[PDB]
Symmetry: D2
Subunit: 308 residues, 4 copies
């Protein structure tokens, strides 16, 4: 029985991350589309919606997706797609911490291993994935850990799903949080997403950013609080008042690992707030936006934040 | 002959016990009697999530005024913003005697409360002659950490405090420190920041970057006339287009603008994907956003010139 | 319906780690047995066999086990029990990096959370566990990372299974490697375990340790090699010769994280060696001993090392 | 005017390419021409899993002999044992010019090979005036690491090399280094170890601890008359009873015995669960077993007295 290489679609959102990688046509039949071409620091709602509708639409036509993405916001898009993709085939985002034209450019081998991952039958049903520096990382926990390191992407709370050696993956973990077709989030018909902004906390923090998003009518605000999701008093006060009038308010934390818990120093039930768990501010944003498509009920949003 | 150690408290008790009435931290931790002569003062009482410029100015004046009246300082402080105060004092304290900050990640009435042993080791540190001229320090989880790099890495772990870029100065075992490192960046009496005469600090605020980021936080700070704005950028200090547009205007209209990053480690570098000179921005290096705010505030007490601010950010 | 606290047995192998913790009788009905009393640096085969036979024997009589253990070798016993326990109820090992009589002693809260973990219905079917510093860690990957830190125990390759806040656990992972009742390893009738020793590699490494265990007739030798399971030439040569005459030889690595892979710089098939994967030397020992109770066939031992 | 950098190769090529015949590392990495004047020498050709005392003695003599003939040194070396050679040279090199070691975790013919950029940054380091008097260095993955603390933390990761106890000295961005740290432990010309006249080194071997550990490795080293034995202990240097019994006899019968630990970070401390003075042991501190072996070997060229060995282990 002859060998039959799987069909992998590469959806590009930005420039090239290798530049191509000839060794790919030994492990797969690759076709490419350019969906957008933006620096990922300009990543946005409309790109997310395109990617989710594109993956869900083209599911039938291929064996897996690799998405090439700037590293800056890959962790946000990864998680959005983790929640909105309904396609049962592997979806593997990949990027490069050194540019394709650089010495020891890292994109070529990351792309190789991204395709390996996307062709591996064992990668399906693990959620949307991020493959970087020989590692398969779940889209929920993966975050950018260092501003330059090639090893920067890590799942800082629950670890990676497997490591990649010589084109093979040893999977020892899968995320237990509900993803992809187990979520109720369906963007197939949405033209926009609810407006969710992020305010930082720190000593002497001004409440003017919070007030501005409130006055703008934002659907939700994520607080990147201090410690275990705590807020500077003025920020607290502004966000407490907004919640009494329907603004969703998720307490996250600027602290780079660890859950922002319930039943700690903030009485969320009293105040109408939601605890983000291990979702960092930009990740809590992704889930809050998608939550607000179902409900503005803070008890139900908290539930969503305990399931997804 | 034991060193005199002053304890400046800014909140609740880091350690409990020993308070039973015959008819207070040196009772909670009786073994302080073995290593120092401890006197305490309550400077303020607040949770550190409410920390503010006024407390900072108080602490630095208190230490610089009372330097000659003691051999070292321990500051008990909430853990949420400890890393911001430690860097502030690291730049404003002119006393070369050790200033050690400590807190607790478990409340003082809880099983396996960490405050009691933390306070002990912080006094050990404050009392070690070798701790002098290392800058302001944070002592947590058996570890001496420099006030510049130290940061809270985890929301609940007792080991949360780490110097995530250049690592600790020394470890504490059995009341002794093996220092193998000292911060090269200029601190305490090698900085020009003098806050002895200041009743306030320049308004500096922080905005976050993420996909689809609103410019409304940045614009709100511009409308209030903030003297500086720290961007918590994505990756190496990069900016969402709308935030970029607003800060680019701000830098040319009197606002000092510093690119840091939301990424928890690594420098936001010059000569990367933002032409800082074109835009009048300053890059924060390894200073995360809250730490960058500290140096930008004090930078603005000396200058508004973005090139002088960048040299400051390359030195302190 | 009144509350009914679960019955947790604490098997002690050494001194006290708290000293007791009254808050335990709010979350469980605790009974204690002393199985042995040794410093865990003298941990041994006979203690392991006792613990496995005791857990399997007393399964019916309780709702979960907590085992208090010295921290030095907890990661070895944890993994042994991970492979030999057949009891479907939680088995949670716990220890203390500061002694019970010390300031801010860590044992009392570790023991609390060990019991929480052992009483949590969600902890069952996750393998044998290690609970340390608010964290639930799987017995296979957990290792001692620092010589003194209270946070020392971490699953350095695949991360922890959940974190413990306010007596509750958020499980987001479970180990995929086969454990407990999914292994064929049955020590219920064994009086001894096959002899497996560990040799270190380094520059100018003497082959005399390897030779001594060979000459002693050791059933298996684990090499704590350098890098990706490589060996100093003289150690290599001695171990190659022993394998030709039936000695099992597993290539592990002194390097503290990362798999010792197959298909790298050693041709294991040629030489009769087995790659340890992410099992560090002392962990590879545990699995090799148990492997040699089934087989001396290096291809089958390699398979075991890819399944357990 | 560019610094002269000598490259001592101990194995294969760290970088390939540029070798096409008109009818070699400065061709593989043409951009060396921009930062230094590179001359190469092949000292030995071996995989570093086979590294040995003879290579060590060669490298230290070569650097100390040719110090005056160049401005700095880069040593390309296999990654398996790099951390052992870097510490050896850190104690035996008397040239204060930078000695930078580099290797590669991906082979030089592989996708995204790391050697080419590693060699570049190692030359950057060797060529930076600020890299002098910091001891022998390892430059991997954009990071200057001190030869004492640096270690291989992961079997395959390109970022494997870390100073797991006290952290890096500086990071490399765009051919520049921001040094914020320097090792306090005494190195290079501040040590008494002089190997200029030595054709061999004292026999020092390593034994592992684990449950049910055989004493046969330890006894085998005792039977061969080894001058030292490093224990890779469990936890804080603790010993399995049978290994303990054998090393306790060994320490009183002429064998130097050093307690290190298999645990990948933290010190094996004095004044813990082993009475070192009772037994004539020495504690290795933060030196893992292979690094402890290095200093014990060189310690034994000066003394067999366990108390003098412990002071050495407290100083270097």
């Amino acid at each position: 029985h002859h060998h039959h290489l799987p069909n992998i679609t590469i959806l590009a959102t930005g420039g090239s991350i290798a530049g191509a990688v000839p060794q790919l046509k030994d492990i797969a039949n690759v076709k490419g589309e350019q969906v957008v071409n933006i620096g990922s620091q300009d990543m946005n709602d409309n790109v997310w919606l395109t990617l989710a509708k594109k993956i869900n639409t083209d599911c039938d036509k291929t064996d897996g997706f690799v998405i090439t993405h700037g590293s800056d916001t890959m962790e946000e898009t990864a998680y959005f797609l983790d929640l909105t993709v309904k396609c049962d085939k592997p979806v593997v985002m990949v990027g490069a911490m050194r540019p394709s034209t650089s010495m020891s450019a890292d994109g070529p081998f990351n792309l190789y291993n991204a395709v390996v991952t996307a062709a591996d039958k064992a990668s399906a049903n693990r959620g949307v994935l991020v493959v970087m520096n020989d590692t398969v990382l779940d889209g929920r926990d993966v975050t950018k850990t260092n501003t330059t390191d090639v090893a920067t992407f890590k799942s800082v709370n629950y670890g990676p799903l497997g490591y990649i050696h010589n084109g093979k993956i040893d999977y020892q973990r899968t995320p237990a949080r509900k993803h992809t077709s187990d979520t109720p989030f369906d963007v197939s018909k949405l033209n926009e997403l609810p407006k969710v902004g992020i305010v930082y906390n720190y000593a002497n923090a001004s409440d003017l950013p919070a007030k501005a998003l409130v006055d703008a009518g934002y659907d939700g605000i994520v607080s990147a609080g201090v410690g275990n999701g705590n807020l500077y008093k003025s920020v607290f006060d502004t966000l407490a008042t907004a919640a009494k009038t329907g603004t969703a308010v998720v307490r996250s934390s600027r602290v780079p690992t660890g859950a922002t818990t319930q039943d700690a120093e903030v009485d969320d039930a009293k105040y109408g707030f939601v605890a983000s768990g291990t979702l960092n501010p930009q990740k809590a944003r992704v889930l809050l936006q998608l939550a607000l498509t179902q409900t503005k009920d803070p008890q139900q949003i908290q539930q969503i934040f305990n399931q997804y």
